[PDB]
Design a protein around this ligand. Structure first.
Ligand SMILES: *[C@@H]1O[C@H](CO)[C@@H](O)[C@H](O)[C@H]1NC(C)=O
Ligand SMILES: *[C@@H]1O[C@H](CO)[C@@H](O)[C@H](O)[C@H]1NC(C)=O
Ligand SMILES: *[C@@H]1O[C@H](CO)[C@@H](O)[C@H](O)[C@H]1NC(C)=O
Ligand SMILES: *[C@@H]1O[C@H](CO)[C@@H](O)[C@H](O)[C@H]1NC(C)=O
Ligand SMILES: *[C@@H]1O[C@H](CO)[C@@H](O)[C@H](O)[C@H]1NC(C)=O
Ligand SMILES: [Ca+2]
Lengths: 173, 543, 542
């Protein structure tokens, strides 16, 4: 509904690069997107750490359902809202190991991982969206992407050097 | 105004407009004894700090606030205290003369020339130190930056814990954290940028700053940090047996109640002055009272947190003086000859037992280390064996732990410039064969030489030294603004040895570091041979 | 112009040969002179007996036959000189007349009472011949008489069983026998009886150390030299004579339970039959060689020298920079460095082969792992090769050598230490390589002074040739009064830096030695740190 990005045949990606000396490291994070697709299997938005670091965030599709998996340094834990081609908004937030997710006005789903665990998504490097290089490029519509006070797609519309577009993509207007 | 006034969220304060004795730097608007927390006098004792109640009118904040409780005529740990601190002991006592339980106050040194913010942590030990000792004016007069000094709970009053909810201890850090929060919401009124807050400590304070870097509570209260001479993992950095030391403390006090909470109440009902005067003697190279693994401040041992990389990538400066355990070489410090063979082993044997106390593997370490720190070119000389003994200790407590800090941090893509100090000022008490010692850099950071010889550091300095003193602060302030000690202000005399020098980062693979001194140069691996022995080999000999 | 002399066993005729070089004059050579009975029948595996006198004039002017030794038989290249492996064919040319009777010696006499210098050949305890080195340059250069010979080797020289049936150590008995003959024969040769000295390298160096501790060496030689070798190296002497001898007999065919019966079995087998057999010893150990007999070796060499039961003789020792070239051979042919995993692998097999101690191995493996690794360029790879090479060199050659020197010095004996760094620019040898074990020999014999040979196809240089000359002077001078500087202060005789550096005595407290090389100069220690490691720290790890 908002700033709409369309992934055409095969799809593509907008790639946003953090400056080497300004890469952040946050215990808690906020994620929010509005998609419109009917894919039964795909990966929507992946965000991995720098080289040599296994902390990473993935928000994907499995059997048409929207699941999110992630690791902060110890292991993987996944939560899913157990897509119809319309502008459905999904908000994903975390605080260290604590993880919560919700789609539109549906009841919130939250996880409380057990045991001592790391609590920082150490040294993020870049943001991947659409799964162009994950083997599951996304083909649909994405509006209102958001990340802990950084809506990259809006910066993508601003034509910034840190950001780079690649693959099959179309913009409204 | 020569007697300016300023406003804060808690009211208004009156400061001074002192003029420094130099003729190159401008005026500084100082502030003395600014409150930042409720004085924990009554039941508040051994409770987390609370922000102070706002005052009406204008507060006369132009006098040095009272020092926090601490004893000088006692068995203080001389091993970890800065050398100058023990030398001119009575001079230090002069500064700590108004001990009062309402010690939570902080100062400022606003210069005239948004201003960058530099905050300081003091403390040679964890049971000693009053911020007033250091005159922050000069630095603020040279870097056009905000210098802040603060007091916090010390000794038993700050780090008393049973390990349970009745007593968590670690209060001092909380007080420092609170002040940072205070500086977060106040400094802008004085003209200092809240987004460029930097913390630099030394010795025991150096241990504090790292704890903050690992703190959960300190998530966004600064951006940069400095450290020096002991980072996080020294034998004395963190206590682990608080319960054992508390029990005897209360026993010597008298009310050694079986339950901690009952013990907590009795102490809360006992005068503060009595607590300080009471004597507690911890095992050598260990701290009776100090920060402990709790869960709310430090979730786990710093090594564990550091290994997995638990921190929000604050740029760091870490350094160590060449020879720092001067006080550790004490008995033979005043011998015309060196350390004898009969006395050399004994030193090592005692050292190994105290730290690596273990009956299973003792001699293997005892023999191996014995050989390692002995230049066989002059095996029987004796005199040079003293230096290595000094080199032995300093390597273990400061160099190696600091190196481990840098590598681990660098491994997680965090800007870190390692440094090292070799120059020193001729001190009457210090021996000729000594070198830049633990605490022979704080004056340079504060630029005391610019002012000249003072009560704390009567040893005068040469013009050459003065030139360097400017160099270091230029580097420090350079970092405070951008982070690259070169970026903002190119170096200058203001010949100059430090003109072409380019200070690189500290990559884990290539351990490039800066060798500050009379002849600054960029080396690649500080004492590579020894450091590896203390981080890779020595762990394996414990099965 | 064929000189003739009258020995105690008869008259012999030599050859007054000439040399291509001019400053050195003609030299008289007697070749293949016997000095004991051919150990053919029952005499085999028995102490040597005096040679049989001959009538008229002996025609000794030709190279004698070589002792039995299967050259092509697989043998440990680790303990042999590199040149002995790169020029196997050159030796084969030299060793082509294998005869069980080989107890002869080849003399050398200058033209212009002089000292006598006895050489000991053989990299291992099985190969080499006196004819290998046509040592004649030294004789005239030092106006000394150069003596080279052959001795019973391994099977025929040192077979033992722990009993009187097989005493072994007969090779040494050949040595002293040769010394005894020289004592009573060299008298009417211009040789100075009070300047008889013995020297060698590798295996021979080991023999020299053993000779010094023998009870059969009373008198005879006075001084001695030993380069690249000691009596303490793992391969200096054997400690399982029965096992190797037993499995040899089984390989032979008649391994009777009684030792005497096995001796008869061997004594009834032909020389070529037994010698060609192969017995594979445990790596870094000797199948055959001197053992703790008591007759020649009262005890393990280190034990006696502790006690210092010998008549303190003036000695010269040295070791080349890197003497384990072959020890890095499989990995020597990699463009990059040695892999960390491979380097540890190689180090892992090094420790167990030498210690294998149940009490603790990882500790020694760990301690050595950290120590011999320059941490400045941890991931060099190339450096790792150098250390791995160096490591071997200290343990097998340098560290044992320093210990023996100290012990000998401790018992107030004139001891002089040196080290070799320069080496030939051999094409086969890698450019990055260094002075390998035995590489000093051509410069000891001035091979460059007379041009390269099948032994040493080296593109020598003006610097190389002169370097040998100064080297000879030290050796020769030391053989005169026990000082490498007393008789003749060195002179080029051809920017010479050798006239000013003065050899100093090797005191235990200050390890002064001589750094033979392009830029000679005295140093106070040889990798002092490492030496103490292999002598002090490691033993404390029981
Ligand atoms: C995260 O989970 C832990 C474990 O239950 C809990 O103690 C903590 O309060 C949680 N934090 C938040 C922000 O929910
Ligand atoms: C502050 O101190 C000055 C000098 O002592 C005095 O004149 C003034 O009245 C004081 N004001 C307050 C509010 O304390
Ligand atoms: C100041 O220090 C210098 C050292 O260079 C010394 O020569 C001089 O005597 C000192 N002056 C005083 C007054 O101590
Ligand atoms: C043998 O002696 C004769 C004369 O005595 C001499 O011509 C000949 O060269 C000698 N040959 C050898 C091999 O000694
Ligand atoms: C040996 O080879 C080197 C380089 O290949 C050359 O300079 C030199 O002249 C050669 N010497 C001889 C004698 O062939
Ligand atoms: Ca992690």
């Amino acid at each position: 509904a908002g700033t709409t990005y369309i992934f055409s045949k095969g799809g593509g990606q907008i790639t946003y690069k953090w400056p080497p000396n300004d890469r952040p490291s946050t215990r808690a994070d906020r994620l929010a997107i509005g998609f419109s697709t009917v894919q039964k299997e795909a990966v929507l938005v992946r965000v991995d750490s720098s080289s040599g670091l296994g902390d990473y965030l993935e928000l994907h599709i499995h059997q048409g359902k929207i699941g999110v998996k992630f690791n902060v340094g110890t292991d993987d834990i996944a939560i899913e809202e157990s897509n119809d081609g319309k502008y459905h908004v999904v908000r994903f937030t975390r605080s260290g190991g604590n993880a919560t997710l919700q789609v539109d006005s549906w009841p919130v789903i939250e996880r409380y991982p057990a045991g001592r665990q790391l609590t920082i998504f150490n040294s993020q490097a870049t943001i991947i969206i659409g799964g162009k290089e994950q083997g599951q490029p996304f083909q649909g519509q994405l509006s209102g992407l958001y990340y802990n006070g950084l809506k990259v797609l809006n910066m993508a519309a601003e034509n910034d050097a840190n950001i780079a577009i690649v693959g099959n993509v179309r913009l409204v207007g | 105004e020569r007697f300016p006034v300023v406003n804060t969220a808690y009211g208004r304060v009156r400061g001074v407009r002192r003029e420094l004795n130099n003729e190159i730097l401008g005026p500084v608007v100082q502030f003395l004894g600014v409150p930042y927390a409720t004085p924990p006098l009554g039941a508040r004792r051994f409770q987390p700090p609370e922000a102070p109640a706002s005052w009406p009118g204008v507060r006369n904040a132009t006098t040095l606030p009272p020092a926090c409780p601490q004893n000088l005529h006692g068995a203080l740990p001389a091993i970890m205290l800065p050398v100058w601190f023990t030398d001119n002991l009575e001079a230090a006592a002069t500064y700590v003369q108004n001990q009062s339980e309402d010690c939570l106050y902080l100062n400022l040194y606003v210069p005239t020339e948004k201003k960058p913010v530099m905050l300081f942590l003091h403390g040679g030990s964890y049971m000693e130190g009053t911020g007033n000792m250091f005159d922050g004016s000069v630095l603020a007069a040279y870097g056009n930056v905000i210098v802040v000094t603060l007091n916090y709970r010390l000794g038993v009053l700050g780090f008393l814990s049973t390990g349970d909810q009745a007593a968590k201890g670690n209060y001092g850090l909380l007080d420092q954290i609170q002040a940072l929060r205070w500086l977060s919401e106040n400094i802008a009124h004085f003209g200092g940028d809240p987004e460029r807050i930097t913390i630099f400590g030394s010795g025991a304070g150096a241990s504090c700053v790292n704890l903050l870097i690992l703190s959960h509570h300190s998530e966004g209260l600064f951006q940069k940090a400095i450290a020096q001479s002991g980072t996080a993992i020294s034998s004395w950095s963190v206590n682990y047996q608080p319960l054992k030391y508390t029990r005897l403390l209360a026993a010597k006090v008298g009310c050694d109640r079986e339950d901690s909470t009952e013990a907590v109440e009795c102490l809360r009902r006992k005068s503060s002055r009595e607590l300080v005067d009471q004597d507690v003697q911890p095992a050598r190279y260990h701290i009776a009272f100090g920060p402990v693994v709790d869960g709310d401040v430090v979730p786990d041992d710093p090594e564990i947190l550091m290994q997995q990389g638990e921190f929000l990538n604050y740029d760091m400066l870490i350094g160590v003086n060449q020879g720092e355990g001067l006080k550790f070489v004490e008995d033979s410090a005043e011998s015309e000859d060196g350390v004898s063979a009969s006395a050399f082993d004994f030193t090592v044997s005692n050292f190994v037992d105290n730290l690596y106390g273990y009956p299973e593997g003792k001699d293997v370490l005892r023999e191996t280390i014995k050989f390692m720190y002995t230049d066989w070119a002059d095996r029987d000389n004796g005199e040079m064996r003293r230096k290595t003994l000094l080199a032995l200790f300093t390597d273990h407590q400061w160099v190696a732990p600091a190196v481990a800090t840098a590598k681990l941090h660098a491994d997680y893509q965090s800007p870190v410039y390692f440094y090292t100090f070799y120059h020193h000022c001729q001190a009457e008490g210090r021996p000729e064969w000594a070198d830049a010692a633990h605490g022979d850099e704080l004056p340079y950071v504060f630029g005391v030489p610019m002012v000249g010889a003072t009560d704390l550091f009567p040893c005068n300095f040469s013009k050459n030294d003065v030139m360097l003193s400017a160099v270091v602060m230029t580097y420090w302030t350079n970092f405070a603004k951008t982070g690259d000690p070169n970026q903002p202000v190119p170096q200058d005399t203001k010949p100059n040895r430090f003109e072409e020098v380019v200070w690189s980062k500290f990559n884990s693979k290539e351990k490039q570091y800066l060798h500050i001194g009379l002849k600054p140069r960029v080396r690649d691996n500080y004492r590579a041979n020894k450091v590896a022995f203390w981080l890779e080999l020595v762990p394996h000999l414990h099965n």
